Design a binder for this molecule. Structure first.
Ligand SMILES: N[C@@H](CCC(=O)N[C@@H](CS)C(=O)NCC(=O)O)C(=O)O
Ligand SMILES: N[C@@H](CCC(=O)N[C@@H](CS)C(=O)NCC(=O)O)C(=O)O
Lengths: 208, 208
């Protein structure tokens, strides 16, 4: 079955976890501690020297988006055809791009860069609102009429940004409604409210 | 057919171009000039305000890796099964990660950061050598026994790094042989030697 090896934080595992929870899939969590990481062996055994590490049977994966695409592929959350699959990738690449900027701020220069980051945030969120406006008035999902792995990744990105900049979605009606709608999905709602999710920090340096 | 809209540089379009050339596909190049970009209208019309922009029929795409995955998916260069597709993604994510570091150096702090970057390079290339060593002794491709879009992306990454740090592949027999072998593919060889490729700078700021 599934095993996710990661630090005790939501981080880059939050989206795939929401995905697995919402899809009614079971998985095992293998928590890695500082001591363990700092010990070096595990790290050295990781393809790119980083976590998450994911196991699906004897298939061992690295890279959060690889895991997301794998689950999307095997679980049927990658578009209804090749055209939708491409749009799904386009959304996820966009999500990853903003996530990289967010991670840089959080771990690299939170104090000094927070103001500029937040001023620039609307410009960075606009593209997703636009995608939403172009797909059934933004009443279903980010791509097509079925959920995809990019939805889970985008939802996570929006969630962590509302904590960083409360009300940043006030300027985007479709995105706001989207967050509320997806967050209300029964299995996802229960997971998001659980101690398993709630009691984990968003990041590893205590900033958010 | 295919149309790629980009600046007159290899950059993030080099890999998908090598792919199209090697696969015997025809495409149109729409070159964007400073004046044109600086004008602002094109940029404003881009999903994430960036190029490349790709067109396949009435399907318009953005993000270099989205285009690579699209072509890999539609042309059959995405693994023989779901397991291989996942490994292909894992390699590409790794390639993208190093590419991001390379781009940062090139455009952000070439002079001051080149020494440290080059010292750290071996550690960054090691994972791809290992992947090769684990796939048929590294005698075929990065994943499986058929070429995939990750191969073209990795090949490009290795090619631009040899220019940045000549001989960086010397200590990696599999990667070295891999570059030579793939570069020798008839259609790819002809394309790489053509003025269309050769007379284009690697980057846009004249550094390499
Ligand atoms: N591109 C990778 C990034 C992985 C990454 O940044 N991992 C961090 C934590 S989220 C890590 O392993 N840090 C420990 C280290 O680099 O030694 C992915 O998407 O999974
Ligand atoms: N994640 C995007 C990055 C695209 C990107 O960085 N584009 C640059 C040139 S390679 C650009 O459009 N720069 C102009 C601008 O940002 O205004 C991709 O993979 O295509």
């Amino acid at each position: 079955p599934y095993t996710v090896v990661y630090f005790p934080v939501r981080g880059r595992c939050a989206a795939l976890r929401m995905l697995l929870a919402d899809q009614g899939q079971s998985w095992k969590e293998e928590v890695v501690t500082v001591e363990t990481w700092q010990e070096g062996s595990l790290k050295a055994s990781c393809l790119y020297g980083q976590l998450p590490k994911f196991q699906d049977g004897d298939l061992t994966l690295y890279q959060s988006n690889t895991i997301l695409r794998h689950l999307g592929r095997t679980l049927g959350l990658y578009g209804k055809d090749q055209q939708e699959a491409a749009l799904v990738d386009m959304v996820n690449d966009g999500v990853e791009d903003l996530r990289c900027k967010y991670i840089s701020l959080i771990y690299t220069n939170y104090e000094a860069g927070k103001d500029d980051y937040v001023k620039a945030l609307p410009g960075q969120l606009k593209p997703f609102e636009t995608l939403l406006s172009q797909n059934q008035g933004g009443k279903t999902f980010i791509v097509g009429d079925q959920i995809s792995f990019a939805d889970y990744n985008l939802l996570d990105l929006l969630l962590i940004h509302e904590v960083l900049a409360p009300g940043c979605l006030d300027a985007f009606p479709l995105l706001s409604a989207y967050v509320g709608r997806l967050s209300a999905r029964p299995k996802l709602k229960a997971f998001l409210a659980s101690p398993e999710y709630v009691n984990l920090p968003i990041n590893g340096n205590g900033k958010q």
